Design a binder for this molecule. Structure first.
Ligand SMILES: *[C@@H]1O[C@H](CO)[C@@H](O[C@@H]2O[C@H](CO)[C@@H](O[C@@H]3O[C@H](CO[C@H]4O[C@H](CO)[C@@H](O)[C@H](O)[C@@H]4O)[C@@H](O)[C@H](O[C@H]4O[C@H](CO)[C@@H](O)[C@H](O)[C@@H]4O)[C@@H]3O[C@@H]3OC[C@@H](O)[C@H](O)[C@H]3O)[C@H](O)[C@H]2NC(C)=O)[C@H](O[C@@H]2O[C@@H](C)[C@@H](O)[C@@H](O)[C@@H]2O)[C@H]1NC(C)=O
Ligand SMILES: *[C@@H]1O[C@H](CO)[C@@H](O[C@@H]2O[C@H](CO)[C@@H](O[C@@H]3O[C@H](CO[C@H]4O[C@H](CO)[C@@H](O)[C@H](O)[C@@H]4O)[C@@H](O)[C@H](O[C@H]4O[C@H](CO)[C@@H](O)[C@H](O)[C@@H]4O)[C@@H]3O[C@@H]3OC[C@@H](O)[C@H](O)[C@H]3O)[C@H](O)[C@H]2NC(C)=O)[C@H](O[C@@H]2O[C@@H](C)[C@@H](O)[C@@H](O)[C@@H]2O)[C@H]1NC(C)=O
Ligand SMILES: *[C@@H]1O[C@H](CO)[C@@H](O[C@@H]2O[C@H](CO)[C@@H](O[C@@H]3O[C@H](CO)[C@@H](O)[C@H](O)[C@@H]3O[C@@H]3OC[C@@H](O)[C@H](O)[C@H]3O)[C@H](O)[C@H]2NC(C)=O)[C@H](O[C@@H]2O[C@@H](C)[C@@H](O)[C@@H](O)[C@@H]2O)[C@H]1NC(C)=O
Ligand SMILES: *[C@@H]1O[C@H](CO)[C@@H](O[C@@H]2O[C@H](CO)[C@@H](O[C@@H]3O[C@H](CO)[C@@H](O)[C@H](O)[C@@H]3O[C@@H]3OC[C@@H](O)[C@H](O)[C@H]3O)[C@H](O)[C@H]2NC(C)=O)[C@H](O[C@@H]2O[C@@H](C)[C@@H](O)[C@@H](O)[C@@H]2O)[C@H]1NC(C)=O
Ligand SMILES: *[C@@H]1O[C@H](CO)[C@@H](O[C@@H]2O[C@H](CO)[C@@H](O)[C@H](O)[C@H]2NC(C)=O)[C@H](O)[C@H]1NC(C)=O
Ligand SMILES: *[C@@H]1O[C@H](CO)[C@@H](O[C@@H]2O[C@H](CO)[C@@H](O)[C@H](O)[C@H]2NC(C)=O)[C@H](O)[C@H]1NC(C)=O
Ligand SMILES: *[C@@H]1O[C@H](CO)[C@@H](O[C@@H]2O[C@H](CO)[C@@H](O)[C@H](O)[C@H]2NC(C)=O)[C@H](O)[C@H]1NC(C)=O
Ligand SMILES: *[C@@H]1O[C@H](CO)[C@@H](O[C@@H]2O[C@H](CO)[C@@H](O)[C@H](O)[C@H]2NC(C)=O)[C@H](O)[C@H]1NC(C)=O
Ligand SMILES: *[C@@H]1O[C@H](CO)[C@@H](O)[C@H](O)[C@H]1NC(C)=O
Ligand SMILES: *[C@@H]1O[C@H](CO)[C@@H](O)[C@H](O)[C@H]1NC(C)=O
Ligand SMILES: *[C@@H]1O[C@H](CO)[C@@H](O)[C@H](O)[C@H]1NC(C)=O
Ligand SMILES: *[C@@H]1O[C@H](CO)[C@@H](O)[C@H](O)[C@H]1NC(C)=O
Ligand SMILES: *[C@@H]1O[C@H](CO)[C@@H](O)[C@H](O)[C@H]1NC(C)=O
Ligand SMILES: *[C@@H]1O[C@H](CO)[C@@H](O)[C@H](O)[C@H]1NC(C)=O
Ligand SMILES: *[C@@H]1O[C@H](CO)[C@@H](O)[C@H](O)[C@H]1NC(C)=O
Ligand SMILES: *[C@@H]1O[C@H](CO)[C@@H](O)[C@H](O)[C@H]1NC(C)=O
Ligand SMILES: *[C@@H]1O[C@H](CO)[C@@H](O)[C@H](O)[C@H]1NC(C)=O
Ligand SMILES: *[C@@H]1O[C@H](CO)[C@@H](O)[C@H](O)[C@H]1NC(C)=O
Ligand SMILES: *[C@@H]1O[C@H](CO)[C@@H](O)[C@H](O)[C@H]1NC(C)=O
Ligand SMILES: *[C@@H]1O[C@H](CO)[C@@H](O)[C@H](O)[C@H]1NC(C)=O
Ligand SMILES: [Zn+2]
Lengths: 499, 499
């Protein structure tokens, strides 16, 4: 019988008690990255994260940081491989920058051979060290040209441009890459990119944020989400019809959270909690498992919710071999009004829920996850049991899928000096406590989880935060980015992997 | 009788001997800037100078600098006005960033109202201080979307997108702006952007520079130059047909140089010198004055030189009310082979000339202009008489045009400390020696020159050089960009203007 801790102090950093041998022999352990966050702009065209961070520097991070140079994995990809080799990792998730291989967006405009060569060399280097690549086609970095031609995922033109990009990736890299992710965190671009305008491309209703160049936060999230699902599904169909000889697997990436009632004896909070599951997870998992959006979304969102045709429904339903599930934290849910006629209405209001990290009796859900220095009542707290609850829910609700945990990690402040930054015991605690619950759910609930990739390989540009936080298991000096030095967490993870 | 110095030491920094009163009462004196170089990316979309500097950081400058934040004239435009007011300047040349007012490139995709407001406030502030705006529509910063959709000026689609952009500018700003420049330095994008790939977008033949993503240095410069002329001419026709009520004037910007024979008794060097005038100046001025390219270009370039239809010829011929002439330096010319079958052939080779700053007897043409620390035999030297020779030539060869000198200036090294940087006596010498010759040519040759704008108002991002050189008449601290402090040159220029 497995017992796992939910509160500080944690004792799962002892590899005598928790290590890779606790999991099945074939289980993959590694780390993750994304292209905007690590590569730099050298050698690629411009994408909407370049555009957004440059047009709206205060939205890029408090330091106005961006991905222009970052950790320079364009130059230092071998050093990334070296970290993975030091870890004895068996997996690495990275993304392909669309703008590096097709700078002009549309494949018929030509490819960048040198960009293709960059990923060939990375892939070959990984495989030579026994590391399985997990490759994200689209980690938010849409070529700027496509956003300017037709507003990107706002328009159905995205589907064929994404398909042709993906086809090039399968053609060039699929002989070696056997695990593909289509779109990173399906929920995020619709809501943050087109709802709150916290993320690229930065569209919203005028009264939500007067700096947005255009948008409608009530309608566009739904349009974009719908196009994401269709573009994803078209790529999965292309993969499974035209690249079956490659013997690989493909799936989407979800951001997952668990949700608990703010007041577990209040029917209204219980209802809000179940609505959140539907609106947060079901928005995408309903289509992916059934070809339809959840009924509560149909009912609430009404004419703002697009319909799938019968052909589209069939294309989207079942459009995965596995799910990449990202998991960071859990929220309490309580009811909230949905003012659909307000000029500041957002899609996110349609769930009719307010989310907190403290429940009605004043209980904080778990240890600190992210401090918010401008408003401490907005601090985020984590909840290790949430990974158990999410995986159990996916198994039970969503037809026992094959799952890889494609991100899980925690930040430390960029204000810490290097010695403090390397002494990242809070990261060991977060990672181990989640791994304990992941082992527990696999054993107790028989969830088909076959790997775990911690966020992040190394310090990088963090969307929305610049270089003001660090997520890496290895440390990068922003004054001299060449080295990636394993932190205490990376050293712990090395021991966990090879105990 | 006016006597002007050609060699150090110069004594024209004495405003007792040379000042604004030496020129006609109406003559405009000011300074110049461009949008990529000064504004920053905040509040605008991405353009090909963002793309180029980010994809090819070693081509942005030795420091890998770029226009992301620069002097932040987005925030500090009032401080630019303040410099101009301190100078008692009567003119200011600035550019509109296309990506700030139409981030999606094509006008039908929507405009950025806040971008429009930015230029309205600048323009209104200038006029309130008695400063005449000279506004460049296109200072190289093409929206990235257009380059990615159709490769920008490589394709005739540029013409209508440029026209619709210009129409928006005339509509929004032409009630106040009475001097418009279409395209900055017509020669530069074809040759550097599409020939040598030193400049955005960075296209060339594969053996010219293997880093180029695509291109053909032998053909594309000509295509791009042809489209520039057509796009320019379509905008001038639009202006003069639809905006005549505004009572303003429009013209192109030329980069001018003079050319002297490397050996003034050698017929081959004399011939190369005359070819250079045709290939450098006539490439554009032939079309602008006659609707045809120079015969030597027709003959040499052959099938690589596009033809104008009779309608196009008529549109381009006479498509200016004035010329903005930029002038920095003069070169000696000697013959050079034109290897049209070589895989590394460039359009620039078609002139059949090699350019130097030292003549056959070892004479350097004038004082140092720009030191090249990697190769000192590649140092640039200036030649004050060249402004006289250029203006005389334009009057005689090109039908006595109205001229404004739209740039003239010199750099100092970014390695200098602030006190050295503010003690910019080399800049006084360059500016005064050229102003002396400009007065001389107006008086002696009756060239219709009606203003002079020195490059640059303040230190900025220099194309190709990052922040490794400074051109400003006012100093900017890159650690805190708010202030623009007049250098010795700016203080001199203040006295020259109001002696
Ligand atoms: C998994 O996918 C299944 C589909 O493959 C989902 O089942 C569908 O659920 C639909 C409701 O979401 C349901 O459709 C309703 O059908 C009513 C019956 O119509 C038939 O008989 C009519 C009925 O009197 C007639 O007009 C129709 O022409 C048919 O003959 C119908 O009125 C409904 O329309 C009203 O409600 C929708 C909102 O739900 C409004 O958008 C619409 O304007 C109208 O106001 C609805 O019809 C659907 O209307 C929209 C139109 O685009 C669709 O094509 C039309 O179908 C449908 O019958 C079933 N299909 C079957 C095969 O069962 C299933 O939903 C879950 O299970 C069903 C039983 C129900 O409990 C749902 O609430 C659950 O979500 C999906 N499962 C999951 C887990 O999501
Ligand atoms: C200012 O613009 C003026 C035009 O408005 C320029 O004058 C034109 O100069 C053209 C040469 O560049 C000249 O065209 C040549 O015409 C030859 C005569 O053709 C007529 O009689 C024929 C002759 O036997 C017959 O086939 C034609 O159908 C006509 O009836 C002719 O062969 C020439 O073609 C050969 O040379 C061109 C290269 O120059 C090759 O491209 C072509 O394949 C061929 O090998 C040339 O014809 C032009 O051919 C190209 C085609 O696209 C053009 O439409 C065709 O016209 C033309 O006659 C005159 N036009 C007039 C009205 O004078 C003027 O040029 C300068 O002055 C002229 C006198 C000459 O000295 C030029 O070298 C100078 O540049 C321009 N001025 C300046 C300063 O540039
Ligand atoms: C978790 O949710 C539960 C369920 O909602 C909360 O308990 C409910 O709390 C209500 C007060 O917020 C209680 O109603 C009140 O009852 C007193 C005594 O009769 C009365 O004077 C009030 O006016 C009020 O009555 C309601 O007024 C509004 C009418 O529309 C409605 O019909 C009336 O019910 C309610 O009885 C209680 N329900 C239960 C089943 O206990 C619970 O609140 C926490 O516990 C209750 C017992 C009370 O001590 C609250 O102070 C305390 O906050 C909530 N838990 C937390 C931690 O918020
Ligand atoms: C400025 O250009 C002028 C004109 O080209 C240069 O003068 C010419 O310089 C040529 C040498 O580069 C002289 O030709 C040579 O004459 C000597 C004496 O006969 C002879 O032994 C050589 O072989 C050579 O003759 C040529 O060989 C190649 C044959 O195809 C050709 O037919 C022969 O001419 C040439 O006479 C001279 N022309 C004139 C009109 O003087 C001039 O060069 C400079 O001055 C000359 C006089 C000489 O002192 C050169 O050393 C010196 O460089 C050049 N000025 C500069 C500074 O480069
Ligand atoms: C978001 O787009 C929706 C749909 O176009 C706009 O909502 C509508 O508003 C028009 C004008 O009021 C209404 O007549 C419709 O009844 C509404 N339709 C629905 C589906 O709600 C909403 O004004 C736009 N919001 C913003 C801020 O522009
Ligand atoms: C807030 O969260 C706390 C902690 O999960 C809940 O408290 C638990 O309540 C259960 C059922 O009453 C008790 O058995 C436990 O002993 C309590 N745990 C502790 C740490 O207090 C609490 O019920 C939640 N409040 C609401 C209103 O939902
Ligand atoms: C530049 O484009 C020119 C024109 O397409 C290419 O030049 C031609 O080369 C083809 C193949 O040799 C030739 O048959 C033609 O005779 C040439 N045409 C002319 C007008 O010169 C040139 O190969 C291309 N250069 C590069 C590096 O791709
Ligand atoms: C190189 O440039 C120098 C300077 O312009 C030329 O020298 C002048 O030559 C003229 C005509 O012979 C003499 O009258 C001057 O006195 C010379 N000036 C000085 C400063 O020497 C020289 O002729 C040029 N060389 C060539 C080969 O063209
Ligand atoms: C691995 O952890 C298991 C408990 O899951 C433990 O029994 C085993 O001895 C540990 N391995 C090492 C080498 O410490
Ligand atoms: C940040 O930038 C936007 C312009 O993009 C401006 O609207 C907003 O006021 C600025 N935010 C703060 C908090 O200053
Ligand atoms: C598959 O490849 C063939 C060859 O390009 C193409 O005809 C077919 O449409 C593609 N298939 C998809 C997505 O099924
Ligand atoms: C607009 O929304 C903000 C945040 O969503 C809220 O605090 C404010 O009350 C809203 N105003 C109206 C008019 O509803
Ligand atoms: C930068 O870091 C690398 C790796 O530690 C080191 O070899 C190189 O010398 C350092 N550069 C400077 C300028 O210190
Ligand atoms: C790498 O992991 C394999 C598999 O568990 C193990 O056999 C090998 O010893 C490990 N190597 C190192 C250096 O830890
Ligand atoms: C201006 O320069 C002229 C010579 O061009 C001179 O005569 C005049 O006195 C100077 N003005 C002043 C105020 O020094
Ligand atoms: C600069 O960058 C390019 C890649 O864009 C590379 O091809 C070239 O070798 C580098 N230049 C130098 C001098 O290192
Ligand atoms: C002028 O404006 C009118 C109204 O848009 C348009 O019909 C006409 O084509 C434009 N003219 C140009 C470039 O001449
Ligand atoms: C190619 O050109 C470079 C510079 O243009 C030159 O130095 C080299 O000799 C040329 N090579 C050939 C094959 O002509
Ligand atoms: C930056 O420069 C401005 C103008 O001199 C000054 O007022 C401001 O205090 C300076 N900021 C810092 C942080 O020194
Ligand atoms: C501004 O220039 C005008 C025109 O020459 C002159 O009358 C006025 O005195 C000058 N002002 C200053 C402060 O120099
Ligand atoms: Zn940047």
């Amino acid at each position: 019988e497995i017992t796992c801790q939910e509160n500080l102090p944690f004792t799962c950093g002892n590899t005598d008690a928790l290590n890779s041998s606790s999991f099945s022999s074939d289980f993959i352990f590694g780390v993750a990255s994304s292209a905007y966050q690590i590569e730099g702009t050298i050698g690629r065209g411009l994408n909407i994260w370049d555009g957004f961070t440059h047009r709206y520097p205060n939205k890029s991070g408090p330091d106005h940081g961006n991905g222009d140079t970052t950790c320079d994995s364009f130059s230092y990809w071998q050093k990334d491989i070296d970290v993975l080799d030091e870890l004895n990792a068996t997996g690495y998730r990275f993304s392909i920058a669309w703008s590096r291989i097709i700078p002009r967006g549309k494949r018929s405009r030509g490819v960048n051979e040198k960009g293709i060569d960059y990923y060939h060399g990375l892939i070959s280097g990984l495989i030579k060290k026994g590391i399985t690549p997990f490759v994200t086609l689209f980690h938010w970095d849409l070529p700027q040209t496509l956003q300017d031609e037709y507003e990107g995922f706002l328009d159905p033109q995205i589907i064929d441009d994404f398909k042709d990009y993906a086809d090039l990736c399968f053609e060039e890299f699929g002989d070696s890459v056997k695990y593909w992710l289509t779109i990173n965190q399906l929920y995020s671009v619709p809501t943050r990119g087109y709802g709150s305008a916290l993320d690229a491309p930065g569209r919203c209703s005028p009264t939500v944020d007067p700096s947005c160049y255009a948008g409608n936060s009530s309608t566009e999230p739904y349009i974009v989400a719908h196009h994401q699902l269709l573009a994803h599904a078209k790529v999965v169909d292309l993969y499974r019809k035209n690249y079956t000889h490659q013997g690989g697997k493909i799936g989407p990436t979800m951001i997952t959270r668990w949700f608990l009632p703010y007041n577990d004896t209040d029917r209204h909070s219980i209802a809000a909690t179940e609505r959140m599951k539907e609106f947060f997870l079901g928005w995408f998992m309903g289509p992916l498992t059934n070809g339809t959006y959840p009924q509560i979304m149909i009912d609430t969102v009404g004419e703002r919710l697009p319909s799938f045709s019968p052909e589209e429904s069939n294309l989207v339903k079942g459009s995965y071999d596995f799910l990449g599930l990202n998991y960071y934290f859990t929220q309490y849910a309580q009811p909230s009004p949905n003012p659909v006629n307000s000029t500041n209405h957002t899609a996110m209001m349609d769930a009719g829920a307010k989310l907190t990290y403290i429940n009605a009796s004043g209980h904080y859900i778990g240890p600190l996850f992210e401090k918010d220095k401008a408003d401490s009542t907005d601090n985020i707290y984590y909840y290790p049991k949430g990974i158990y609850s999410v995986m159990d829910y996916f198994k039970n609700k969503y037809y026992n899928p094959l799952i890889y945990v494609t991100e899980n990690g925690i930040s430390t402040p960029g204000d810490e000096n290097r010695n403090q930054s390397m002494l990242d015991y809070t990261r060991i605690d977060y990672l181990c406590s989640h791994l304990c619950f992941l082992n527990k759910v696999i054993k107790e609930k028989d969830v088909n989880v076959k790997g775990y990739l911690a966020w992040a390989l190394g310090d990088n540009y963090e969307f929305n935060k610049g270089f003001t936080v660090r997520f890496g298991l290895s440390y990068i000096d922003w004054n001299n980015v060449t080295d990636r030095d394993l932190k205490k967490s990376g050293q712990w993870y090395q021991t966990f992997i090879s105990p």
